[PDB]
Amino acid sequence: FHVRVTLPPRKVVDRWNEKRAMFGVYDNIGILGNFEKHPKELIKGPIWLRGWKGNELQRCIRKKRMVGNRMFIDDLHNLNKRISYLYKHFNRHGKYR
Amino acid sequence: GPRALDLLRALPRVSLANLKPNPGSRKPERRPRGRRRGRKCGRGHKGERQRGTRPRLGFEGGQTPFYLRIPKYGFNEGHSFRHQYQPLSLNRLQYLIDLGRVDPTQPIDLTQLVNGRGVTIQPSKRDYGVQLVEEGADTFKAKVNIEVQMASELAIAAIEKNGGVVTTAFYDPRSLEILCKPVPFFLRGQPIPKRMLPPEALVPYYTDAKNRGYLADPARFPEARLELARKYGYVLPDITKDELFKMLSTRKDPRQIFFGLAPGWVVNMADKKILKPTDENLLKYYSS
Amino acid sequence: PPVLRKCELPVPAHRRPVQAWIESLRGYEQERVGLTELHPDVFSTAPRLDILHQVAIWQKNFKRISYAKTKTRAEVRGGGRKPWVQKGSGRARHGSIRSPIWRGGGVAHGPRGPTSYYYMLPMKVRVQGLKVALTVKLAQDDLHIVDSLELPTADPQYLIELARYRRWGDSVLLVDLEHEDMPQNVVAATSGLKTFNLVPAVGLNVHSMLKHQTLVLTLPTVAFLEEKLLWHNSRYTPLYPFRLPYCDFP
Amino acid sequence: EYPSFVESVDEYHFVERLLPPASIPRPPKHEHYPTPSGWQPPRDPAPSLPYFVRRSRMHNIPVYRDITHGNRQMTVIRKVEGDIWALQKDVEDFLSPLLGKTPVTQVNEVTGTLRVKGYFDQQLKAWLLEKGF
Amino acid sequence: YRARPPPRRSQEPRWPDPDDPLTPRWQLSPRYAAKQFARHGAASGVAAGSLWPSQEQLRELEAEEREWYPSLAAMQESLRVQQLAEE
Amino acid sequence: LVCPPIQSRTYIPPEDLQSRLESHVKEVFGSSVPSNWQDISLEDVHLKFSFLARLANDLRHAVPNSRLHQMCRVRDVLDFYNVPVQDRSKFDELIASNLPHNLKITWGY
Amino acid sequence: PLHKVPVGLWKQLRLWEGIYSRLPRHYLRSLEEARTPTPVHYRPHGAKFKINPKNWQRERVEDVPIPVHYPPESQLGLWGGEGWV
Ligand SMILES: [Mg+2]
Ligand SMILES: [Mg+2]
Ligand SMILES: [Mg+2]
Ligand SMILES: [Mg+2]
Ligand SMILES: [Mg+2]
Ligand SMILES: [Mg+2]
Ligand SMILES: [Mg+2]
Ligand SMILES: [Mg+2]
Ligand SMILES: [Mg+2]
Ligand SMILES: [Mg+2]
């Protein structure tokens, strides 16, 4: 349970750095922008996850449908197994039925 | 106005630092830690359930399940193929006219009802269109040219008395979809398709002047129409002598989706132009 | 010459507009250069901090994708085999040595996959949020309607000391009507500053408004916002997306 | 062998009909109130009461009914700008002769909302019409 | 700081390389072309005459429509016989 | 380009108030005063802007953007300028408030 | 990480690079298009649309070939497009 004996270097975060100052800027792009682009377009991320959401099973299932043929063998195999597991678990296990 | 605003001069800035979700908005979740929510953690003791394995939903523990001892009977039998007509009461029609959503001046068909959001069609659910029902019959004072896919004697009667005209028209599913949301169709880049005819079961409906069917022989119209007066005891107006008459007489071709456009044309909405085929074969196909 | 700005949209019969000084940015010393009416349904809206919260939280989260992944006992490297026999060895029974109990083993639950937190607050709520932010910036005296935005010079020190003379607080949000039309003196001055931030109208948002102590709105910018936000009280629910042809709508 | 076509601008007024409005039309002026459907517009001036009830975006009186747990019946008055406590007083003074007892109420001052136990929806739309909101 | 230029939706016609194998097969369709016309159609560089069925397509549409959708007279005839048998 | 030294915003109403304000009533509106000079309405934007800008240069004090919806009559401006505003903090108010001998406050900022 | 191009296309883009690029175009165009082989073992229904006997509704109908195995000794003779089922 030994706790560190030396004060860490105090980390100074300036909140006025560029990324923090400009945060959330174009979020209203739809409303103020005479709707053309939905805020989804702003989302930088994995291809299957842009502007979408879901529980781990749905997530995996979707990843496989979209990028499943660009995947590495090991990773595709792992994904299939994860899907099968999650399927069995969600459908057949739990308290609530 | 909002006296709340005057309390805001006195208080500190609203910043990201002080922000409270409305009390009750978030019911805090609880985790199986500690003396209360730990130690069997709401799962009970041993058996099938503490282990998470209890059987599927309908299962009664081996006795023949309730939902399977009851005998099969056609209830939902062929449900997908039944026709569905979204009801529109005269009360709603009147209320829409009164508030200037649909205007009685020009002819009223499905697209007009949809654009006023007086009604909502979803063809995918096998909606075949609007039907007219009599709920507001007594109260109905408006003078309209209306086209629906079904109507009741009483509804028709209530529209005639006020000097309007009702007509029942048929649209097939594709036609219907195009009709209700026209602008999404015009971005589709396809010609305007032929209106299909009604199927064999619905022919005796649209061929009768009783229903004021769009396929009905107009020779019977003024006869049957007058009949409806004798029954409900009102003087039938002469629609001919009215000033709005040229609008009231307006029909569609039985093969036409819209008013004033024609099967086989193409609407280019960026140039605000229409395009029509000069070809003979195309003109024979679309005009048949 | 006095610049007086009347509202361009109908106010309700029971409610008078609200007013604010039109300040000019050219001199230190010219504070009230004019007088403006702001619409009560935009800047006078009943202050709702609850909705402010909803929208700020939304802006924060809806963008977020967590890439944090842990391996389950399935994805760990080896241990397909029972490390010793079920009985007689005298010790605890185990399957794979990669079980979540074991040292190097898989993680029992842990984070899974890139995860998206994404949701949409309904339109009218985000609109209302913007209205409220504006209202509150005004009611607390921290909103300044400026004309122009023409600056006498590109030295940012000028801007800092200007904000010192008018007591504008530490941070300032400068809203302009369009991105290309921004005067170059401003752009120069504000490109080298951390606390002073120049943003076009379509980039106005709740978060940025709560981050900066003071809001500075151009006059055409006000005329823009007022219309854009007010449009929603009178509007039908969308039939199809608004980016498509509508009768009255662009 | 693309078949021939003809470009005319003259039928486009038939397409202009099919474009739906994105905004809701101000109601047409009539010669007689109330209208057949019973809709009555707000007055020319506004009353002197220390509260105001905005119309709905569709121009109706914002009184609704609400159920919960299947047995709990309530009536909500919405969009109340002013002293809401005034409105509570007047509403319970209006409803009291009906039930023999003061009606149970909830005032949400921040929401600008009143909430009443039971279904009074009709009588309350009538009473808010009488006061010309 | 000063914000990035706002993200905008280019309203010009957009044509993907028909020769690039990484391009999706839904953006190579006739349907995509027609949609590209209905969006702009002057500037599209789409032949307008392409928006109508070919001679083949037309002959098939014809054949199908004549097979599965009878004539009004044919159907009234079809009904009168059934009503007769029931009588 | 020079920067003028900041104002202290500490404001006390002068005894000549009524006369300054009625003189501005006369010169701004350009009107021979109707019998009650404080009850004349500010609803016109030219008159309001000129009146209040003049008051602002004369009285060395301005009306904040939130209160500008609150001024209708001239009576409102009268009442506004009657109330003093102290820019001293609560702490600084406590230093000068005549403290007992057994209480020492030291400012460590 | 991900392959930029789907593995199903690794056979095709194998033919766009290297010596295969210099093959005569008519040959490559004879390999490219795979025409559906004449039905041999399964017997095809002609119509595209078929009225469902139970349902009484017009149903879309497609023809799915039955996988047939060709032992390599079939490549030494001519079996008439047929083989092992
Ligand atoms: Mg939990
Ligand atoms: Mg316990
Ligand atoms: Mg324990
Ligand atoms: Mg136990
Ligand atoms: Mg047990
Ligand atoms: Mg429905
Ligand atoms: Mg393993
Ligand atoms: Mg094994
Ligand atoms: Mg032992
Ligand atoms: Mg095992």
Ligand SMILES: [Mg+2]
């Ligand atoms: Mg590990």
Ligand SMILES: [Mg+2]
């Ligand atoms: Mg409810």
